[PDB]
Each structure stands twice: as structure tokens, then as C-alpha cells.
Structure 1
């Protein structure tokens, strides 16, 4: 039962997103652009995963939409506070879509990522994504991810499940989502 109540002033949610912000801020100058996010998605991740140009393009479209949801844009340098406001807007919109059974941006992003590893992904594939995207380079943390989630009979992870977990993790600080990335993301 996905938590749909938001908790935007909870220091743990804020911290989760500051962590991710700093993670995206290679430079460390306190500012990120859509250009850097998309380059990470397309030049870094998709290339290393050896996705087809079609998969690469659709993944890029999903990433563009997702981060535009939080106010990001090409050539626009964004600092953390504005970024976080943008995330409040994104979360709100996404939860409204989810409630109405309209596809979320996080779901569609998920569909692209899973399609690259193709309707499930394995623990090894997730460790691969973890190290390549850099969100979860500790294989133990990825194993903690697979222990956290409800896997299928094959021991693999479903996109429905990962979407529910991600809704809980990024949008609502759902207690049921805590530890989704092990100790990799607070």
C-alpha cells in the first residue's frame, strides 16, 4: 500500500535529495544543468550499457521529461533550494498521476532502463547499473536492494515493484521504502 502523503519538510527527504544533488554535482560548485544530467544518461550510462540507439534515445527522452519535471532545463544552472522546490512540484504531480492510474515519469524512466536490460532485471544487471550510474556502486548495497524488494519467482526484480519502491523513496519518504538502496542513499 503505497504511501501517498508527502513529507517535504522532513530532514530525511531533504537529505536524500541533497545527497543525490551533490552526486550529480561532479564539479562540486553547487550547481547542475540538464546538459550534465542528460550527458550522464546518454554519454555515460547508455553507452556503457551498450543500448541500441533507439533504447538510448527513448531513455534520454524519459530523463529529459523527468528532470524538466523538477524545473531543470538546458543551459540553466540550478542551485539546491530551487532544485528542491522543483522536486516538491514533481512529487506532487507524480502522486496525482499515480492515484489516477496515469503513467508516471518515474515509471516510464523505469521502462526505458529495464528495456535496456531486457520485463525484469537480475541482481547482476542491477549491480551493473549500480556501478555504471554510480547510484549504488557497492554490490552489497545492491544485494540489500534485492533483499528489500519483493522479487519474482526467478529471484528477479519487476518494474512494477521498483516503481512502487521509487515512489516511496523519492516522493513520499515511505517507511516501507527505507533501505531501498541499502546504505548507498540515505
Structure 2
């Protein structure tokens, strides 16, 4: 099943992979000084996202713990200012390590993060994300930025064409977009 099929090979020297991360580094660099801290990352990728998704305190704590673990896996730390080339080096180490974990059936930081996000989107605890649940927070949270893109990306994530998203579909597409430059994940953010 495509929802469990992940590439064994990264493409770190592909300019498209580098540019995806470059776009994020600049987005997350709040004070615009060309260095990223774990403070800035957690503020934009966690504080702001959880608030916009209307997470509970418990869901926010859990998502923050995931994001901290994930970005420390890239060499990030609170108060530690890191320029982009080193940021990218951290991502290279992280992706390589996590893909080995994936292939050995060991837990991954990326799947833990996906669980935390999925839990918030799944407001009724159905174990599924319906189109209405997705549309509610897609544009608001900053994940989709258009209605067209939002409905497209939903169809694109719904790998088994069930009309709804499960945690494995979502995570596998997130991992494909950020770790492996997987062409099957290309539409995730519109």
C-alpha cells in the first residue's frame, strides 16, 4: 500500500530539496537575522500552528514535545543561532537516520509529529480526517493557502481513495515532502 511505501534513497544534492528547506528557514527566521534558533522554530511551527488549529493545552504540549525532539535531531537548541548551511546539514543527518529507523521498523520522530498534528485535526476522534475537518484549518493554519489547493491536496493525501485521511496517509506524504523529495508527495502544500 502506498501509505506505507517510503523511498530508501534521499536526494540531498537536488536544488529542489535544498530550496524547500531554504523557503522554511526564511519563513521561520522571525527576527530576519539569517540565523535560526529552536525558539523561533517552536514559536512558528508549534505555538502558532497549535493556536490556529484550536488545540487543547494537552495537544499543544504533545505537539511541542514532538517538534523539539524533531528539531534537536537537526542540531537545533534553545538560544543556539544556526545559519542555513548548518541547518541543512542537520536535516541531512536527521532524514538519513529516520529513513534507517523506518527500514528497520523502529519509531521515527516524524511519525510522532504526524500523530500530534493528526490528533488536533481529528476533532471528533473518528481516527480519520474528513474533508470538512481539513478545510476548516487548512488555510487558517497556513498549510494550504487556497481553497482549490486545499481540496486538491486532500485528494492527493487520500492515497487509498477512501474519501478521508488516515494518520499513515498524512505522515507518509509529510515524510515524502521533507525527507526524500518523493514525487508522490509533491502536492502536499499546494
Name which of structure 1's ranges 61-70 and 34-43 shifts more when overlaid on structure 2.
Answer: 34-43
1:92 aligns with 2:100: no
Does the C-alpha gap of structure 1 residues 154 and 9 become closer, same or farther in structure 2, counting only changes over 3 Å? closer
Rounded to whole Å, the distance in 1 between the matches of 2:39 and 2:171 is 25
Does the C-alpha gap of structure 1 residues 23 and 41 become closer, same or farther in structure 2, counting only changes over 3 Å? closer
Cα offset, 1:154, TM superposition: 5.5
Cα offset, 1:47, TM superposition: 2.4
Rounded to whole Å, the distance in 2 between the matches of 1:21 and 1:128 is 27
Does the C-alpha gap of structure 1 residues 101 and 115 become closer, same or farther in structure 2, counting only changes over 3 Å? same
Q: How many residues align?
A: 181
- For structure 1, list consecutive stretches of 5 or more residues without a partner in the other structure: 182-186
Cα offset, 1:61, TM superposition: 0.3
Does the C-alpha gap of structure 1 residues 132 and 74 become closer, same or farther in structure 2, counting only changes over 3 Å? farther
SS across alignment from 1:74: coil
Rounded to whole Å, the distance in 2 between the matches of 1:98 and 1:54 is 27
SS across alignment from 1:154: coil
- For structure 2, list consecutive stretches of 5 or more residues without a partner in the other structure: none
Cα offset, 1:70, TM superposition: 0.9
Rounded to whole Å, the distance in 2 between the matches of 1:79 and 1:11 is 18
Rounded to whole Å, the distance in 2 between the matches of 1:100 and 1:128 is 36
Rounded to whole Å, the distance in 1 between the matches of 2:118 and 2:152 is 19
Rounded to whole Å, the distance in 2 between the matches of 1:42 and 1:164 is 20
Does the C-alpha gap of structure 1 residues 93 and 53 become closer, same or farther in structure 2, counting only changes over 3 Å? same
Rounded to whole Å, the distance in 1 between the matches of 2:155 and 2:22 is 25
Does the C-alpha gap of structure 1 residues 80 and 128 become closer, same or farther in structure 2, counting only changes over 3 Å? farther
Give the alignment's TM-score, normalised by structure 2. 0.85
Cα offset, 1:127, TM superposition: 3.8
1:103 aligns with 2:107: yes
Does the C-alpha gap of structure 1 residues 85 and 153 become closer, same or farther in structure 2, counting only changes over 3 Å? closer
Rounded to whole Å, the distance in 2 between the matches of 1:105 and 1:129 is 23
Rounded to whole Å, the distance in 2 between the matches of 1:180 and 1:46 is 19
**Contact in 2 for aligned 1:127/1:137 (Cα 8 Å):** no
Rounded to whole Å, the distance in 2 between the matches of 1:114 and 1:142 is 16
Cα offset, 1:41, TM superposition: 4.3
Name which of structure 1's ranges 5-14 and 30-39 shifts more when overlaid on structure 2.
Answer: 30-39
Q: Provide Cα deviations, 1:51-87, integer angstroms capped at 9, x if missing partner.
A: 2221111111001001111111100111110000000
Name which of structure 1's ranges 50-59 and 132-141 shifts more when overlaid on structure 2.
Answer: 132-141
